[PDB]
Design a protein around this ligand. Structure first.
Ligand SMILES: COc1ccc(COc2cc(C(=O)O)ccc2-c2nn(C(=O)c3c(Cl)cccc3C(F)(F)F)c3ccc(Cl)cc23)cc1
Ligand SMILES: COc1ccc(COc2cc(C(=O)O)ccc2-c2nn(C(=O)c3c(Cl)cccc3C(F)(F)F)c3ccc(Cl)cc23)cc1
Lengths: 262, 259
């Protein structure tokens, strides 16, 4: 459909914007996690005592599980802002009907947050504070009530997603494909969204073949991962609903508040 | 990896087996639904249902109307499970898998393939039954009482979207094989040969769709997306089965047949 020279151009464009939009890349996260460096090592939070020191080292007086939860939402709000900025760079997105732009972001940001959170994860924990900290999976799993169960499904996905060994240039196109989904509820003009997604899919297909030439059917394996993404988002909102019934003492950021309607 | 000549041979092998395994193909069903070919008996309300149960030889009649139709769906699904089980044995490599893994793949796969293949029998207005001798309207099914009406309509809602892809039987034979060989089913013992086979099936499906739908850009990717959806739809489906088989409280022996 599109000449390969044009598909390579689209990949370069999107990769360029991804670097401009997202401060902590997968390449940087892997350098921090795999060590070999003395200037990039994170402070590790694994228990109540190391958390207390972490607030002093890495530089709102409530229960611990609460404090950590609000820390996540703060970062999620930032991610939404970064993702919104990235989507405006996707060719054709800002030319869509304005209601559809909103609709695509509303149902797209969480699937992308989960995708990109995997970059910050290994089987034992997750980078935080722009990579200055690292909080262990075990510590997250041991938080009380429903909060302990919140964090773990992210990890089971990440371990599976990370086995695909995608780099940032692959992820930049995958993320674009997620945003331009014509099956979001309430879309007004499905067809121009599908046309954009077709080009992005072509670009993702060629990128994955060139960048992982010994990785057979990686394109198909990557698309199937959108199953896993859909299931965790559902688990996530369902757990939020429980919290929005036990903890009437707290609420969400207006941006998250509006995202989670319908 | 696989030579193109080998992928076509695999596509042909699967097509031939699919034609032998399934009584009513998509091509035959489309002929019936479009009137392009003895008209099927139409069930559109309570009175014609009663006549249809007499004229058509329903094998499942042993209660309330909405119940009876539900039991017919179950009867036909149990039939389909055996038809799919027979088809999977023709998939190159399947019978050499560990026997527990063969069972596991079928246990979690049949529901997705039944939904997929039910689309072949559907249009926006109803569904073929009894090997195409009957046709029950969408409207009559949607209007069934308590949860039964909302049970039937999601099948149609999927089918309308899936059918816009305009796959034919030779496309579907490979797609069905791909679903069966899913290496992420829980409880699998030896994932590697399952993913290896699926890798070859995926190669064959990609080539089939390019030759058979050369004007249909990224149809391969679009179909893979539908395999995703199927996962969520089956989950909603089974949950509703649990409710219907719990809120709508027959014989213990029939209960075991439909476990
Ligand atoms: C103590 O300090 C911190 C501690 C943890 C974090 C979380 O790390 C993330 C990083 C990014 C990043 O950097 O892109 C992005 C997300 C998180 C993160 N969100 N989240 C949530 O529950 C969440 C999500 Cl997904 C989406 C919307 C709303 C929410 C929330 F409202 F319900 F909260 C997580 C749950 C578990 C884990 Cl392990 C990570 C996340 C940040 C700082
Ligand atoms: C006299 O009444 C009828 C007799 C036969 C039919 C034909 O129905 C099918 C045919 C095939 C065929 O021929 O390939 C295949 C499927 C059905 C059919 N399954 N199904 C289900 O709920 C269902 C499904 Cl999807 C998957 C797994 C298990 C089940 C079940 F266990 F929960 F049942 C339906 C729901 C609605 C409709 Cl409209 C059709 C189906 C319809 C009505």
């Amino acid at each position: 459909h599109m000449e390969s020279a044009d598909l390579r151009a689209l990949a370069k464009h999107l990769y360029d914007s991804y670097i401009k939009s997202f401060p902590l890349t997968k390449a940087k996260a892997r350098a921090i996690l795999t060590g070999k460096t003395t200037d990039k090592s994170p402070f590790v939070i694994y228990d109540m005592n190391s958390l207390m020191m972490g607030e002093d080292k890495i530089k709102q007086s409530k229960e611990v599980a609460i404090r950590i939860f609000q820390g996540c939402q703060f970062r999620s709000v930032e991610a939404v802002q970064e993702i919104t900025e990235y989507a405006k760079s996707i060719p054709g997105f800002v030319n869509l009907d304005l209601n559809d732009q909103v609709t695509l972001l509303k149902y797209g940001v969480h699937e992308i947050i989960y995708t990109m959170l995997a970059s910050l994860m290994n089987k034992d924990g997750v980078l935080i504070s722009e990579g200055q900290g690292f909080m262990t999976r075990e510590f997250l799993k041991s938080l009380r009530k429903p909060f302990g169960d919140f964090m773990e499904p992210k990890f089971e996905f990440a371990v599976k997603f990370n086995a695909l060994e995608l780099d940032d240039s692959d992820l930049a196109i995958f993320i674009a494909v997620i945003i331009l989904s014509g099956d979001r509820p309430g879309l007004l003009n499905v067809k121009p969204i599908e046309d954009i997604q077709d080009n992005l899919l072509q670009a993702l297909e060629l990128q994955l073949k060139l960048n992982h030439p010994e990785s057979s059917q990686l394109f198909a394996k990557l698309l199937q991962k959108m199953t896993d993404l859909r299931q965790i988002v559902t688990e996530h909102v369902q757990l939020l609903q429980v919290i929005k019934k036990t903890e009437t003492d707290m609420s969400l950021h207006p941006l998250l508040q509006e995202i989670y309607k319908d």
